[PDB]
Assembly symmetry: C3
Homo-oligomer: 176 residues x 3
């Protein structure tokens, strides 16, 4: 128990890239194969200083159409202290990658990567609320239920030293 | 009592945005007791740069007492002062942010700017020998930055909160 | 509560465009101690060269070691186990420029820093991917650097020492151009 400190959370900013390391993949996976929809949370991060506050979540064992077979990957908007200064709904392109942990000087790494434009009609990409059906419900998270198969996750070095890296790159436009 | 700061407080890039919440309360406290002045966190203009601190009068100060918002910025003793030019001489631009969605319409912020005064004491190099008058120093600012009334219009206040933007024109970088 | 968490701060220790500036305060006293304990080494905070890059640390012997012992300030840098090592190219190959900063106002003066730069030699183990603890363990992380960075005599000149502190800058050259 300790106050404001853990305003480190406000110190978490990107590039606008977050790389999120999930350690204990062995224990976590089984723990999630044990209990359905056990969900891993990334630290919250700001797309950019005074920007949108997002967070990534992973289902190591899958969720929905990917339960028990796939890694499921989503992102979500969180209420951030500068929302009123930002355009809404959130509309930046988002790229997820599961990282191939290989030395880029032995063999070029093959990351597992998908990108999307958010859809304006997803309630979670409009301003932190504003009640808009918080009891819809469905995933408070937009993303891929079949991001990578438990089969494919074991190839190459997507898992290494018992950890995966999740990258989420938010396209940071500037050209008016 | 282990605060252990931090110091990792750095403008981006040159920009500090300062959020005052609990705005209603804080004001009703102002007219209840001048001269009171709330402070922004200390912040380095840039990594290894100048330490500054913004302060406000909710309030109003001197010229602005009772009637306006007054805002000032102060130079503070900084760990990298010996490596920097004195007196502090980077353009500083104040803004009170118009919290309207900047996508469907352009916000209109109120902006005052200045090049710091070489005569102005506070901008002199800190830690000369001070005692004991001094602390004195002593923000340069605007007593009538924006009044009551002409605030309240537009979204200069929203959700019981206002944003103070202090932008410092940073030392540029040399040569390709 | 403990409950550090100081380690959450270390992780936010990141070079500014590849640069660490390390301030060594209490230089008189520290120098004094190094004269009485030759193996006494000062250590910068660890720092990432770039956000998800390499974790390094600069270190210094104020009264010298090896060939500079007693006569010079000696200056080194080492590679530390880093959260992101598996994503990196090994061995560390980035160019490093050490400077001892001349603490003069750059407005009139134009400071004259003392500077040395080196390219990590791949034939040393020092810059190989660190062991996951272990491989090896000892203290591990043996640094590369300069036993004779700057003479005691030269450090007394200009403002290399000022207000009982010295500044060490380590600039790591990032490939950047992609």
């Amino acid at each position: 128990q300790e106050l404001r400190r853990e305003l480190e959370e406000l110190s978490v900013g990107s590039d606008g890239v977050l790389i999120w390391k999930i350690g204990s993949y062995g224990r976590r996976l089984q723990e999630a194969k044990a209990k359905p929809n056990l969900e891993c949370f990334s630290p919250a991060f700001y797309t950019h200083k005074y920007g949108y506050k997002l967070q990534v979540s992973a289902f190591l064992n899958g969720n929905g159409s990917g339960e028990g077979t796939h890694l499921s990957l989503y992102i979500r908007v969180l209420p951030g202290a500068f929302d009123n200064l930002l355009e809404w709904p959130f509309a930046r392109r988002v790229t997820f990658s599961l990282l191939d942990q290989s030395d880029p000087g032995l063999a070029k790494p093959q990351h597992v990567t998908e990108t999307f434009h958010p859809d304006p009609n997803w309630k979670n990409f409009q301003k932190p609320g504003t009640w808009r059906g918080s009891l819809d419900e469905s995933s408070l998270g937009f993303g891929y239920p079949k991001f990578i198969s438990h089969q494919d996750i074991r190839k190459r070095n997507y898992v290494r030293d018992d950890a995966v890296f999740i990258r989420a790159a938010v396209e940071l436009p500037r050209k008016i």
